Symmetry: C2
Subunit: 265 residues, 2 copies
Amino acid sequence: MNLRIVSFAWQPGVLIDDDTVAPLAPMSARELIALLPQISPLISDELVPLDSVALGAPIPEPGQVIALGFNYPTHDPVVFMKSPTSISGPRDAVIAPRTSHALDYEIEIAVVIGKPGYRIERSQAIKHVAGYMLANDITARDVALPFGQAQVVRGKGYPTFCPTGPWLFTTGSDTTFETFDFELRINGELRQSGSTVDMTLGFAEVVETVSATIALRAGDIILTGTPGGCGFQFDPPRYLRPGDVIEAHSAKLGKMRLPVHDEKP
Amino acid sequence: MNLRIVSFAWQPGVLIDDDTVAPLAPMSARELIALLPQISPLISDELVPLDSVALGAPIPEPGQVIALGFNYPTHDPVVFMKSPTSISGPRDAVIAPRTSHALDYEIEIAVVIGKPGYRIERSQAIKHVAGYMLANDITARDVALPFGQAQVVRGKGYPTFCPTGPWLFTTGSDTTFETFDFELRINGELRQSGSTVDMTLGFAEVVETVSATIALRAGDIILTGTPGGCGFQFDPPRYLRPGDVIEAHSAKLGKMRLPVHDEKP
Ligand SMILES: [Cl-]
Ligand SMILES: [Cl-]
Ligand SMILES: [Cl-]
Ligand SMILES: [Cl-]
Ligand SMILES: [Cl-]
Ligand SMILES: [Cl-]
Ligand SMILES: [Mg+2]
Ligand SMILES: [Mg+2]
């Protein structure tokens, strides 16, 4: 029942197995999100290589992208917004703009909204989530705090600053939220390691708190926070460098490989 | 050539005269924006009361809503983002949430993007603007600064916090940006009075500076700043009260009348 839905970089796919995928139309992302609960058994009962096709952002045009700051202890929570045009795919380069010398990474688990809602009650949060995706809240910290009048939208909003995927891991038949363990490496070296059990606000409370002040629609994405190990937390800092490769992994949500390139002056 | 396009509260309309409107389909908002320059002469050459029909937000589902802080001297500029679900119509109530006792008004002129762009050059900015709308960047200042870790997205993002309209005043044949004079009153009393000549960053420079870090699509809205006279700028403050009526006016962009109601505890 937990389907894994991809986008061929519009064309939806589902994972046949953990190594193989198939096109789905023959058998809009936001518009397929809103119809998943009834066709989920259809698609699942009615059930080629993943290394050989190009995979996009699973939700390529979310209505809004909400990101939470300070939702882990090693990194109350602050609601940020990322430009929807920051959205990017699971193998796409992160491009450090000409205007930044302090580009940071932040591995997060995103939920994708499946039914609209406002002042969603905690116990009903699960009914509004279509599923989950791996994500990164890439942030140009020097742009965001040009004198540490913050420019947080600017710092989080450039193209390529919201990598997502490789798939939407659907909620299927779940009556509660799932738990994930996730890691981010750069050139093979461990930078971040988290479990969603360390969230100050769990998935349900995230949906509750965000929707307490922002009305949500199907296709909206919420990044639920990053743990410690970010670039800014060291001396010297460990910000993204030209030629770094970000590798992010979660057992249920797949893997990202994001090459880093600087814009030239 | 400067058409005035409304939305019947989807159904587009054009203003026949300053007192009368007509439906347009027989003769998507974002999708009509992207086709305006070629049908503009069609609609204009091929050219009932306004007090008798309900008028909506002219762009009801913009992809993103950007708002500028500090773009007037009496109020460098800071880029904010409003939730697209804050968008609201020209006669719709502003609803002060249960969680705010400091709801402020900010009359602004918005531009609406008509052609996509990123790192738009100043002299080409006009080619990317479909037109202009009156707007308000309503802000719950106590939510935004819960200890004057800012919650600016929260403070600007509630439903009803981005009134727009009554119409999209199109660019038509203009080779440069136009000038507007605008005012906001509450229960007939003058609060704010501005002219776009006082913008620190003019319309073209707004498009340039915003698009220098955020990629823009057709249907995106930019609020270009508010002048002085906001609630927070007085002792005692002059924040929106239950039963206040906001009246905003610009000669070319029409008028708003927004009743204020508090959510009960
Ligand atoms: Cl989409
Ligand atoms: Cl749960
Ligand atoms: Cl996992
Ligand atoms: Cl729209
Ligand atoms: Cl100009
Ligand atoms: Cl005017
Ligand atoms: Mg974050
Ligand atoms: Mg403003």
